[PDB]
Structures are given as C-alpha cells and as structure tokens.
C-alpha cells in the first residue's frame, strides 16, 4: 500500500483506517478466561478466539480498549503451519479506532479455521462500563466490593478483545476464578467447579448460544438468591446483597408470571436452562438484558412493601417485562448494526405494554401507556428530530441512538400498526420474525416484511392462504396487495423524522383531510414553516366515530389532501378514536368548540382514551399556534365532573406545569391565580383524598398526586397532616410506618426545615431500601436554602454518601426548582471539565444533567447564555445532538409565553371573575 495511513501506538503504521471492522475474519467460538482479584482491583485474562477466514489476508483486526495485550499466538487444526504450538502474532494498538491488529507471518488460506490466542490484563474500572468495581453498604455498616460487566453497546473490547460488533455473533464459554468467599456468575449455567493449588475456586460456565459480545456477563460477588421454577423449567434466581433478600419475592414472583407469559405469547421457548436477575448498587444504567444475567439497579428490581410506592411496583413490573422481552427482541434476534436500535430496545418497551396488560391487569398499565407517546412526540414535533433508525458510526452517535425516539416513538407506531392489524394477526408476525431470525440479525426492513406479510392462523387448510399448497383467490389477491400495503406504511413511519398533523374541516356531509408536519415554536404562517412542510408525507391509518354511532370507521390516507362522504350528518366527529394512532387532529371550524361542548355536558359520549387524547390535542395546538389558549383551558372546566383518573391527571399536569412555569419567573400575579383556581376547582376531589395506601392503582397515583398538588401549594391543612406525620416519624426514630403513597409528601415537608432535612440526610445512609433512598432523596432536593442544595451536589461529586449515578437524577430535581435552578445551571458550568471526567459524553446522564438544567428556561437571556455554552462545547471535543434539542425547547419556551401568557393572565381573572 501508499504506507499513508495511519501510525500505531509503537509508531509502525496500522494496516486499516476503517471504523468499522473488517468481514474478512469471522469468529466462531470465544474460550474466554477470567481471573479478577478485588482485593488487587485487577484482572488478568487469556481468550482463545475460533475464528473462519474467508478472503484471504495477512493481519487480523479487532476491538480491544485499555487492555494490556502481552502474549497473541496463532494455532490452526487445518492450516497446518500453524499447527500447536502455533506461531507468534506481532500486535499493534491503534486507541483512536479502539481496534488492534494481529500480525500474521503468513497470509492466511481461505476458508480454514484458526485459533487466535491472547493473554491479557488491566486494572478493574471505576466507571460503569467494561468489566468494572462497584460497591455496597450491609446492614452492619460493612462495604463490600463486587465486580461486575456491563458492555452495551461498544464496551465489551474493554474486558476482553473481541470483534465488539453485534453481527459478529459468537459462542462463548466464560471460565472465572474466585476466592471461596465469592460466588461467580456468568451468561450460561455453571458446569462444573474444580478446587485449585491455592484453594482458589475455578468456575467452568455451560457453553453459550451463538450470542452478540454486547451481551456477554460475568458477576464476581457474595451476594444471595431465591428461586423458582417457571412452568417451561426455567430456574429464574433473584440475586441480591445478603440483607435485601427479603425484598426479592415480587420480582421472583413477578418475573416467573412474566417469562410464562413470553414464552407462550412467543411461541418459542425462552432457550437457556437459567436466568438470573441481579440487583447491583452501583449501576448506571437501568437495567442491562444480558442473557441469563440480567442486571438491575436496586431501585428497579427490589420491592419493600413498607417503603415502596404503588407505582414503584408498576416501575419495577415493567422493568421486569422490559429486560424479559429483550431476551427474545435483542437477544434470539439482534439488530444487524446500531442504526436499527429500535427493532431491539422499541418492541422491548411495547412488549412491557402487552405483557403487564396481560399479568398484571390488576396493575391498569394499559391505561398509561399513553404517556409514553405524549412524551415522544415533544420532542418529534421539533425539527430536532431524527428518524427512528438513522445512520451512527462513533461510540458516542451509537449512545445517542437510545433516547426516546428509538424507545417511545417506536414503542407507539408498533401500538400503531398492532392496532391496524388486531393482535391475532400482529402477534402471528412477531412469532415468524423471532423464529426466522432467531441467532441472527435482523435489519429495519427485514421487520417490516415479516410483519407486513401475517398469516391469522397459518389456517393450512383444504387451502390456507398460508402454507402447503394455496387456493387462488380474490381474498389472496387482498392478502398480498393490502400486505405490501402496510410494509409501504411503515417504511415512511421509520425514515421520515417528525409527526403528522390532520387537518379536519367539516363541510357539512363531505369531510375535508389535510396532512402535515406537526411542529412547535413555528407558526404556519412564519417564513420558516414553508420550508419544513416540503417532501414529508406519511401513510396515516386513520380511525373515527362520530356523534351519531360508535361505529369504527377505518380509512387509510396516502395523500396530502382527500375528502370522505359521511352519512347520517352529525353534531361531531373524533378523528383517531382511543388515540392510538402516532398523529394529532386538529378540528378546523366549529369542531373544536363542538367537542368541547361533549365534555362539557353529558361527556361519557367520548370514550375515556378520547378525552386523554383530545385534552392532549387541543394543548399542542395551543403550542402550535393553531389554538387560542383559551379553548384549552376551557376544556379543564369539564374535569371538574371527570371520572376517569387518567383524563383527569393529565388535564391536571398542563394546568400544574404552568404554575412552576410561572414559578420559575417572578410572575407571581398569575402563579397566585393558578394557584387559586387549582384548590379551588379541583377542592372536592383533593378533599375526598385520604392519606392511606388504599385503592385502585389509579385511585393511589391520583391520592398521591392530588396531596403533592395541594403541599406544593401550601394548602394548610394539608400541609398540617404532613408536618404531623412527619414529626410522629422523627419522634419514632424513623419506627412509625408512613403509607407509602403520602411518604415522599411528608418527607420534603420535613425537609423543609433544618431540623428535618438533617434527620432525613442522617437517614438517607442507614436505609436498607433504595426506594426509601430516593423518596428521601427529592425531599433533600425541596429545600429552598441554597448551600443545602449544594453540599446534595457536592456529595454526588464525592460519590460516597450519594452515589454517582444518582447525581444527574440529582442535579435534574435541584434545577426543577426555583430556588435552585440557577444554582444547577451554575455548577454544570463551573465543572463541566469534572463531569466529563466522571461521565461518559454520550451517556444517559451527561444527556440529563445538560437537558436537566437547561430544558426549563424560558427566557431570551437564558437561550443566550445555553448558546454559548453550548459553542464553548462545539469549540472542544464535545459534540451532542442534544444542544440542538434544547435549544429548540427553550425556543419554543419563549414563543409559547410571548403568544399565550396574556391569554392565560385574562383567562384566570375572568374566572376569578365568575366565582
Ligand atoms: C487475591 O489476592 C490476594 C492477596 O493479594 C490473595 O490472597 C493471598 O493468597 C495467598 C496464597 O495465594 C496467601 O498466602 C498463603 O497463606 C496460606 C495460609 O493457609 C499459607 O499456607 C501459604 O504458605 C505457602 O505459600 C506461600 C506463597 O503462597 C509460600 O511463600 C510459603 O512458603 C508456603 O509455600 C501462604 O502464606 C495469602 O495469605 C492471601 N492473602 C490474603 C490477604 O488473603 C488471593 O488468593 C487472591 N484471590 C484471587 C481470586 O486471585
Ligand atoms: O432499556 C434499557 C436501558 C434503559 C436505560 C438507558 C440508558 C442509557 C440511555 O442513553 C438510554 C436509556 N432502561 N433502564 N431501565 C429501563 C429502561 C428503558 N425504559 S426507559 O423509559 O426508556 C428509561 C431510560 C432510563 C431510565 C431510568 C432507570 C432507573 C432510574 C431512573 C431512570 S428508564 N436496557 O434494556
Ligand atoms: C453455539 O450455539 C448454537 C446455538 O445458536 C448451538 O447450536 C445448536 O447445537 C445443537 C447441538 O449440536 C443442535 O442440536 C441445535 O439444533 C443447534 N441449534 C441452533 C439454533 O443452531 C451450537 O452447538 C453452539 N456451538 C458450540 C461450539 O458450542
Ligand atoms: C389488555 O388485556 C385485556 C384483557 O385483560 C385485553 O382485552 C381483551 O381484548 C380482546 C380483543 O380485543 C377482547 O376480545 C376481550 O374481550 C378483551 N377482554 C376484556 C376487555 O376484558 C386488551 O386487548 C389488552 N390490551 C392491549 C393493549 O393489549
Ligand atoms: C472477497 O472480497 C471481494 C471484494 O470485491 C468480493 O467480491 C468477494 O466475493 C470476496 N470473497 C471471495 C473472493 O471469496
Ligand atoms: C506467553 O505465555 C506462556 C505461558 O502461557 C509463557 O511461557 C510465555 O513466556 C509468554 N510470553 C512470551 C513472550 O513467550
Ligand atoms: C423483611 O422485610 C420487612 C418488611 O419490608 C422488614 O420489616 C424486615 O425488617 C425484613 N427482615 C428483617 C430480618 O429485617
Ligand atoms: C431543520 O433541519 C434540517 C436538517 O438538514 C436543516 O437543513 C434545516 O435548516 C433545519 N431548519 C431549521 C429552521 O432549523
Ligand atoms: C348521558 O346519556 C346517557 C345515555 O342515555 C344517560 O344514561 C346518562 O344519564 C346521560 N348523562 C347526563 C349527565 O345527561
Ligand atoms: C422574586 O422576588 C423576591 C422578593 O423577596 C426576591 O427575593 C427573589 O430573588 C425574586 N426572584 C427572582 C427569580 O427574581
Ligand atoms: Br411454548
Ligand atoms: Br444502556
Ligand atoms: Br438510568
Ligand atoms: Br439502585
Ligand atoms: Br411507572
Ligand atoms: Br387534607
Ligand atoms: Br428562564
Ligand atoms: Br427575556
């Protein structure tokens, strides 16, 4: 070659400039060895890598980080020069690429398979990622270190070179050492344990399944389990430290209910002969769904009933699900490359839906998951956007890839498309698609065929349309034409950015159908909103009934404008009935007083996921320009007499989130009236609450929220009961059992004087439930005394009286409140150097602590003051798709209060005005 490019470390030139592996070389079978200390902090290691040569070559490459590689010899059974004891490779580390080369003394004969062998070693590290040292409290006040492995999405090159891209698939088997005082854990099973020289223990783990690196696991640790058996034989192991194994049973419980439900839902059998679930202390993420060894952070997993919210139990049932699901989306069957994240992480959060909904009905899942749409699309409606699958190459483009476009967005097109199909039909494709790509890779439109092309019952009859030998048919000619069809659908659903708008004119019978680009701070009539409106057209499958029946009329839309007749001419129609389709309806004329005027009166005449949604539309209009702010205020005036605790909450949260609004500016002449008009509409229900743990899942969150609502307003009375509660609770020594529901309430009531934010510190260390933990944890964050809030913020840099990985949780809470908004703001700045050294670029929590901090600001100053930030970043290494995102947020902040605060200030004194 040219010898242009580029110089390895050691300073001879790398034989590949490429970000992306090479093909070439193809692994089979890693024979992996591990051997950690913990008392060294260290590990030393030795992998033997069986790996197929197609074209042939004279070097191999591969992924290895911060790995001190010291030995590379190369065996081969069929290339006999390589015959044991093998041939030495000359390495090179080329960091930048985070690859290595291994060089051969002779290339390489196609089609033969060889034996790359390397010893290895490195310190064990201190940051959530590779194979890494995390610690816990015993009850006894002992620190115990395990060490444990988390890899998605590129840092299994960090514990053991490997080809670290998720299509390389591979069998492994993981070999550990141990003390006899430590129990080691792995993907697969244990074999077999054989007693050492030293007394040292050596694990020898089942050999896994072809497997993508990402998902390898190794636990070293002490703590203990507790198992059952699922009614496919599945030994599930909820392993915990030694003093929270009480706090395991639901998710035992929980979990073998769930992998039941999976595997028959499924139809394919959940593969390996365990599984096991672990709750760590000191995990950044979630919860990581490595097969066989499931790895949650504490919060996500345990469960005390005595501290434990109902919705903490709701959280960690659908934890539960989320990590189970992927065992079959992401792990049976894996994404070719990242930029198709969502076919792994998008089903695993619509499958949490479905699963729950069918074992825990109890739990009214399905009634908020909703939420999970409505959060996604404020952040489709802005050109920041970006499609559901969208090319990434850096580590860091791949880490951006799991935010909630990839999620949500994805999670709510498939409810979409479930919805176009019936579930019989829907899950009849979500079985042949794990079952043809089962230990394979699947890429965005291998999906879309096996789900566009179902098959009902797969009927094989006389002449299923399915299978064997067909009928030819005029149905079959439906079949395959309305199947291409659906996949045509979905194809612009994942390449086009954003969310469409339906325009909806009533011309007395014909009813008028325009589509477009749903977006925030921009008008129509701005000159930027031409311009963002051009080429975006999507295949919406649209629904509606109307005044007159509850009939589902179904039509799909494939052009910018259609008309459709209607009989019977109605008072109303609802366009997208329950909402469940990824798009907003806007009534032009008389038809979104004419709504407004259903809810107002008899009301139950829309059907309770209508008013979620229609609440939520008539909202975002407001924010689009489209609507008068008054129209949807004047729909809250209806919840006074609604039912539905969904519908309720959320007409509620608009109304409460223009209070902190409010708030956060001095703009205290309508933050007073808000406040007014919140106690004094809403008093029946707020009154009626009771301060217990009774009810419906529902009835508990609207308890909860309800009592926060009025403490946040300092509704006396109810701050009265808090303050009491919580000095019976100091008086006890911590020994009075609040109700759950009201516990976080009472505690940042007595956060709010010294007295009781000191005892809540002192007892934020001694708690053995990391559910109490974090309660106590947004009680310390409610003070309103600035050096308070920043000695929180200096212990979560300490990391040892607040862990680390709660500080962005932590810094995002201070900054919600006004009293510390700019002192969040101002520490992000004066230590943006410290958290880049604590905290990945692309993390999930340098992605917080940023949007945390900032997302809230509303005024022309602040964007100034975050743009130069954020040019301060651009101008170093630094660069995230999220500057942009705020921005836009903070834009559309201040477009948002200049068109509408005038409307809300009238709209309030007018009520005032009338009662
Ligand atoms: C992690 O590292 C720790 C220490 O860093 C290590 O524990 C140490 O193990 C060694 C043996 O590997 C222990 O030393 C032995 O203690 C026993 C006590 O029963 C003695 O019988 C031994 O005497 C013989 O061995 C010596 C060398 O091992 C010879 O020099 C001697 O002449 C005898 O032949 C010996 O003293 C040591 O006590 C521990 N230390 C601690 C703090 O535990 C541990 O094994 C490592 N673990 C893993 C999983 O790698
Ligand atoms: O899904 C996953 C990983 C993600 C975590 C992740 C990490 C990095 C990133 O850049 C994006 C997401 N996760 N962890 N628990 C559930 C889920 C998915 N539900 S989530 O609503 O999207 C969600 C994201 C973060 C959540 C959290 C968890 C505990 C405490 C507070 C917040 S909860 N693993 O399988
Ligand atoms: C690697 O894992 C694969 C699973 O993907 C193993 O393949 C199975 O092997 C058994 C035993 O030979 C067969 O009966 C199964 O039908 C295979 N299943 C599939 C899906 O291929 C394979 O054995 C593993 N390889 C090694 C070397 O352990
Ligand atoms: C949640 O589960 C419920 C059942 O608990 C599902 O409701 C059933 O839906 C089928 C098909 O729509 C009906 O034939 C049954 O009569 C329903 N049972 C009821 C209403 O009790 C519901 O479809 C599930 N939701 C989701 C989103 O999967
Ligand atoms: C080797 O690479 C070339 C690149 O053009 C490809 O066409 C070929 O099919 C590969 N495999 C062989 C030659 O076996
Ligand atoms: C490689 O490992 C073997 C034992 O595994 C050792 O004998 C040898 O000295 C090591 N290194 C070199 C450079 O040969
Ligand atoms: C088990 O959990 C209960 C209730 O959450 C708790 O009160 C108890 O202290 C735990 N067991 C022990 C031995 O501490
Ligand atoms: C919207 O994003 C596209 C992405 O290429 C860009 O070209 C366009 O200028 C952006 N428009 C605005 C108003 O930011
Ligand atoms: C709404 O109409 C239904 C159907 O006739 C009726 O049962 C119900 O009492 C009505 N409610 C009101 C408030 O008029
Ligand atoms: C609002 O006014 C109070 C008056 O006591 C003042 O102390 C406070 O700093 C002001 N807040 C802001 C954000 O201007
Ligand atoms: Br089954
Ligand atoms: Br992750
Ligand atoms: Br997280
Ligand atoms: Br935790
Ligand atoms: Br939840
Ligand atoms: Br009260
Ligand atoms: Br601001
Ligand atoms: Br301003």
């Given at each position: 070659?040219?010898?242009?490019?580029?110089?390895?470390?050691?300073?001879?030139?790398?034989?590949?400039?490429?970000?992306?592996?090479?093909?070439?070389?193809?692994?089979?079978?890693?024979?992996?060895?591990?051997?950690?200390?913990?008392?060294?902090?260290?590990?030393?290691?030795?992998?033997?890598?069986?790996?197929?040569?197609?074209?042939?070559?004279?070097?191999?490459?591969?992924?290895?980080?911060?790995?001190?590689?010291?030995?590379?010899?190369?065996?081969?059974?069929?290339?006999?020069?390589?015959?044991?004891?093998?041939?030495?490779?000359?390495?090179?580390?080329?960091?930048?690429?985070?690859?290595?080369?291994?060089?051969?003394?002779?290339?390489?004969?196609?089609?033969?398979?060889?034996?790359?062998?390397?010893?290895?070693?490195?310190?064990?590290?201190?940051?959530f990622?590779?194979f890494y040292k995390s610690?816990?409290?015993?009850?006894?006040?002992?620190?115990?270190?395990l060490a444990v492995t988390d890899?998605?999405?590129?840092?299994?090159?960090?514990?053991?070179?490997?080809?670290?891209?998720?299509?390389?698939?591979?069998?492994?088997?993981?070999?550990?050492?141990?003390?006899?005082?430590?129990?080691?854990?792995?993907?697969?099973?244990?074999?077999?344990?054989?007693?050492?020289?030293?007394?040292?223990?050596?694990?020898?783990?089942?050999?896994?399944?072809?497997?993508?690196?990402?998902?390898?696991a190794y636990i070293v640790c002490?703590?203990?389990?507790?198992?059952?058996?699922?009614?496919?034989?599945?030994?599930?192991?909820?392993?915990?430290?030694?003093?929270?194994?009480?706090?395991?049973?639901?998710?035992?419980?929980?979990?073998?209910?769930?992998?039941?439900?999976?595997?028959?839902?499924?139809?394919?059998?959940?593969?390996?002969?365990?599984?096991?679930?672990i709750?760590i202390?000191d995990f950044?993420?979630?919860?990581?769904?490595?097969?066989?060894?499931?790895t949650?952070?504490?919060?996500?997993?345990?469960?005390?009933?005595?501290?434990?919210?109902?919705?903490?139990?709701?959280?960690?049932?659908?934890?539960?699900?989320?990590?189970?699901?992927?065992?079959?989306?992401?792990?049976?069957?894996?994404?070719?490359?990242?930029?198709?994240?969502?076919?792994?992480?998008?089903?695993?959060?619509?499958?949490?839906?479905?699963?729950?909904?069918?074992?825990?009905?109890?739990?009214?899942?399905?009634?908020?998951?909703?939420?999970?749409?409505?959060?996604?699309?404020?952040?489709?409606?802005?050109?920041?956007?970006?499609?559901?699958?969208?090319?990434?190459?850096?580590?860091?483009?791949?880490?951006?890839?799991?935010?909630?476009?990839?999620?949500?967005?994805?999670?709510?097109?498939?409810?979409?498309?479930?919805?176009?199909?019936?579930?019989?039909?829907?899950?009849?494709?979500?079985?042949?698609?794990?079952?043809?790509?089962?230990?394979?890779?699947?890429?965005?439109?291998?999906?879309?065929?096996?789900?566009?092309?179902?098959?009902?019952?797969?009927?094989?009859?006389?002449?299923?349309?399915?299978?064997?030998?067909?009928?030819?048919?005029?149905?079959?000619?439906?079949?395959?034409?309305?199947?291409?069809?659906?996949?045509?659908?979905?194809?612009?659903?994942?390449?086009?950015?954003?969310?469409?708008?339906?325009?909806?004119?009533?011309?007395?019978?014909?009813?008028?159908?325009?589509?477009?680009?749903?977006?925030?701070?921009?008008?129509?009539?701005?000159?930027?909103?031409?311009?963002?409106?051009?080429?975006?057209?999507?295949?919406?499958?649209?629904?509606?009934?109307?005044?007159?029946?509850?009939?589902?009329?179904?039509?799909?839309?494939?052009?910018?404008?259609?008309?459709?007749?209607?009989?019977?001419?109605?008072?109303?129609?609802?366009?997208?009935?329950?909402?469940?389709?990824?798009?907003?309806?806007?009534?032009?004329?008389?038809?979104?007083?004419?709504?407004?005027?259903?809810?107002?009166?008899?009301?139950?005449?829309?059907?309770?996921?209508?008013?979620?949604?229609?609440?939520?539309?008539?909202?975002?209009?407001?924010?689009?320009?489209?609507?008068?702010?008054?129209?949807?205020?004047?729909?809250?005036?209806?919840?006074?007499?609604?039912?539905?605790?969904?519908?309720?909450?959320?007409?509620?949260?608009?109304?409460?989130?223009?209070?902190?609004?409010?708030?956060?500016?001095?703009?205290?002449?309508?933050?007073?009236?808000?406040?007014?008009?919140?106690?004094?509409?809403?008093?029946?229900?707020?009154?009626?609450?009771?301060?217990?743990?009774?009810?419906?899942?529902?009835?508990?969150?609207?308890?909860?929220?309800?009592?926060?609502?009025?403490?946040?307003?300092?509704?006396?009375?109810?701050?009265?009961?808090?303050?009491?509660?919580?000095?019976?609770?100091?008086?006890?020594?911590?020994?009075?059992?609040?109700?759950?529901?009201?516990?976080?309430?009472?505690?940042?009531?007595?956060?709010?004087?010294?007295?009781?934010?000191?005892?809540?510190?002192?007892?934020?260390?001694?708690?053995?439930?990391?559910?109490?933990?974090?309660?106590?944890?947004?009680?310390?964050?409610?003070?309103?005394?600035?050096?308070?809030?920043?000695?929180?913020?200096?212990?979560?840099?300490?990391?040892?009286?607040?862990?680390?990985?709660?500080?962005?949780?932590?810094?995002?809470?201070?900054?919600?409140?006004?009293?510390?908004?700019?002192?969040?703001?101002?520490?992000?700045?004066?230590?943006?150097?410290?958290?880049?050294?604590?905290?990945?670029?692309?993390?999930?929590?340098?992605?917080?602590?940023?949007?945390?901090?900032?997302?809230?600001?509303?005024?022309?100053?602040?964007?100034?003051?975050?743009?130069?930030?954020?040019?301060?970043?651009?101008?170093?290494?630094?660069?995230?798709?999220?500057?942009?995102?705020?921005?836009?947020?903070?834009?559309?902040?201040?477009?948002?209060?200049?068109?509408?605060?005038?409307?809300?200030?009238?709209?309030?004194?007018?009520?005032?005005?009338?009662?």
């Amino acid at each position: 070659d040219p010898g242009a490019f580029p110089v390895a470390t050691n300073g001879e030139r790398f034989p590949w400039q490429e970000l992306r592996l090479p093909s070439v070389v193809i692994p089979l079978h890693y024979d992996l060895f591990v051997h950690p200390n913990l008392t060294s902090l260290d590990f030393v290691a030795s992998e033997k890598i069986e790996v197929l040569v197609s074209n042939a070559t004279q070097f191999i490459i591969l992924h290895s980080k911060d790995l001190e590689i010291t030995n590379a010899t190369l065996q081969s059974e069929e290339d006999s020069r390589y015959m044991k004891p093998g041939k030495e490779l000359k390495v090179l580390s080329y960091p930048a690429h985070e690859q290595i080369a291994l060089l051969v003394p002779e290339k390489l004969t196609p089609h033969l398979k060889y034996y790359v062998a390397m010893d290895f070693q490195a310190k064990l590290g201190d940051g959530f990622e590779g194979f890494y040292k995390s610690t816990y409290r015993t009850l006894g006040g002992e620190t115990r270190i395990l060490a444990v492995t988390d890899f998605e999405p590129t840092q299994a090159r960090m514990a053991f070179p490997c080809f670290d891209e998720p299509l390389f698939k591979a069998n492994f088997s993981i070999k550990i050492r141990r003390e006899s005082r430590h129990i080691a854990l792995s993907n697969m099973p244990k074999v077999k344990t054989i007693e050492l020289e030293g007394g040292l223990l050596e694990d020898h783990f089942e050999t896994t399944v072809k497997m993508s690196t990402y998902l390898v696991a190794y636990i070293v640790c002490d703590f203990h389990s507790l198992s059952g058996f699922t009614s496919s034989g599945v030994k599930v192991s909820i392993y915990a430290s030694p003093d929270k194994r009480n706090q395991t049973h639901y998710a035992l419980q929980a979990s073998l209910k769930l992998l039941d439900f999976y595997e028959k839902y499924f139809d394919i059998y959940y593969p390996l002969s365990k599984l096991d679930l672990i709750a760590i202390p000191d995990f950044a993420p979630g919860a990581m769904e490595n097969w066989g060894l499931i790895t949650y952070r504490e919060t996500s997993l345990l469960f005390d009933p005595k501290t434990s919210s109902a919705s903490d139990k709701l959280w960690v049932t659908r934890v539960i699900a989320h990590e189970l699901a992927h065992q079959w989306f992401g792990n049976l069957v894996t994404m070719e490359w990242w930029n198709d994240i969502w076919l792994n992480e998008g089903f695993a959060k619509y499958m949490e839906l479905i699963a729950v909904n069918a074992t825990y009905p109890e739990l009214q899942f399905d009634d908020y998951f909703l939420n999970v749409c409505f959060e996604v699309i404020t952040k489709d409606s802005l050109n920041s956007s970006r499609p559901i699958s969208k090319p990434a190459e850096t580590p860091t483009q791949i880490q951006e890839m799991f935010d909630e476009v990839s999620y949500n967005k994805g999670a709510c097109i498939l409810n979409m498309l479930k919805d176009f199909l019936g579930e019989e039909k829907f899950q009849k494709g979500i079985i042949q698609y794990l079952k043809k790509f089962s230990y394979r890779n699947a890429k965005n439109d291998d999906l879309w065929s096996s789900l566009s092309n179902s098959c009902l019952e797969s009927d094989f009859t006389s002449g299923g349309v399915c299978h064997s030998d067909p009928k030819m048919t005029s149905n079959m000619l439906a079949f395959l034409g309305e199947n291409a069809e659906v996949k045509e659908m979905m194809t612009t659903w994942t390449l086009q950015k954003g969310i469409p708008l339906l325009v909806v004119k009533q011309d007395g019978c014909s009813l008028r159908l325009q589509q477009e680009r749903f977006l925030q701070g921009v008008f129509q009539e701005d000159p930027e909103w031409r311009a963002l409106q051009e080429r975006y057209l999507w295949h919406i499958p649209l629904t509606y009934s109307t005044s007159s029946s509850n009939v589902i009329h179904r039509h799909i839309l494939k052009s910018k404008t259609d008309t459709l007749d209607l009989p019977e001419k109605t008072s109303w129609v609802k366009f997208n009935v329950d909402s469940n389709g990824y798009y907003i309806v806007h009534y032009e004329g008389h038809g979104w007083d004419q709504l407004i005027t259903q809810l107002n009166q008899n009301h139950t005449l829309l059907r309770p996921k209508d008013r979620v949604g229609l609440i939520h539309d008539v909202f975002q209009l407001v924010g689009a320009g489209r609507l008068t702010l008054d129209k949807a205020l004047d729909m809250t005036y209806y919840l006074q007499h609604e039912t539905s605790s969904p519908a309720l909450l959320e007409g509620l949260s608009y109304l409460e989130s223009f209070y902190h609004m409010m708030d956060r500016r001095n703009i205290s002449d309508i933050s007073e009236n808000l406040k007014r008009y919140l106690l004094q509409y809403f008093k029946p229900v707020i009154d009626r609450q009771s301060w217990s743990d009774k009810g419906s899942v529902w009835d508990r969150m609207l308890r909860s929220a309800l009592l926060k609502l009025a403490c946040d307003l300092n509704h006396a009375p109810c701050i009265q009961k808090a303050a009491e509660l919580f000095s019976q609770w100091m008086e006890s020594s911590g020994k009075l059992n609040i109700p759950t529901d009201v516990l976080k309430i009472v505690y940042s009531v007595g956060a709010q004087t010294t007295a009781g934010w000191n005892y809540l510190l002192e007892q934020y260390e001694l708690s053995m439930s990391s559910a109490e933990q974090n309660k106590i944890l947004y009680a310390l964050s409610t003070s309103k005394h600035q050096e308070k809030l920043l000695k929180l913020i200096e212990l979560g840099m300490e990391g040892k009286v607040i862990k680390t990985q709660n500080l962005a949780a932590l810094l995002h809470a201070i900054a919600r409140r006004p009293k510390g908004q700019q002192l969040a703001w101002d520490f992000v700045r004066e230590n943006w150097t410290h958290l880049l050294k604590k905290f990945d670029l692309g993390s999930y929590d340098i992605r917080m602590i940023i949007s945390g901090t900032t997302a809230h600001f509303s005024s022309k100053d602040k964007l100034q003051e975050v743009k130069l930030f954020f040019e301060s970043l651009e101008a170093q290494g630094s660069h995230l798709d999220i500057f942009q995102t705020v921005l836009e947020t903070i834009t559309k902040n201040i477009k948002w209060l200049e068109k509408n605060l005038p409307t809300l200030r009238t709209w309030l004194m007018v009520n005032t005005r009338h009662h």
